[PDB]
């Protein structure tokens, strides 16, 4: 039924995750329909664990909240040198993949935020270059 699109976006995150060249990669989303829906990381690629799965993340909360509420990606090139081990508990995805550099970039469909998709970097691989200019390819 919707097991097709499940497919296709996650074949579409690896692939992704592989060409770019990237560690850990994941896509957020509101878990429901419901007004007052957290949101919760329902896609990944290169995970560790399932951890993630724990993670609940109410609007203008983590890396994915923040995104979806300001419309702008988030870059942290080095987690260490940007945040606190303590302050990384904002950003449970941090802890629970083990990322030491991330980039965050909003998924729009007509102007709107539907989705947060993350690439993450682990052992201090730094980030390959940002290409400013992007696209949705969905």
Do not use: C
Request: net charge positive; charged share 30%; proline share 5%.
């Amino acid at each position: 039924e919707a097991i097709i699109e499940d497919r296709r976006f996650q074949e579409t995150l690896d692939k992704i995750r592989k060409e770019e060249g990237y560690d850990f990669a994941a896509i957020a989303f509101y878990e429901s329909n419901k007004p007052s829906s957290p949101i919760k990381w329902h896609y990944v690629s290169g995970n560790k664990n399932n951890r993630f799965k724990l993670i609940i993340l109410r609007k203008g909360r983590g890396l994915a909240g923040t995104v979806m509420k300001t419309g702008k990606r988030m870059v942290i090139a080095n987690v260490g040198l940007a945040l606190g081990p303590e302050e990384k508990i904002d950003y449970p995805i941090l802890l629970s993949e083990s990322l030491t550099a991330v980039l965050a970039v909003p998924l729009w469909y007509k102007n709107q935020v539907y989705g947060v998709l993350l690439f993450g970097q682990r052992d201090g691989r730094p980030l390959p270059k940002i290409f400013d200019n992007d696209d949705i390819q969905r």
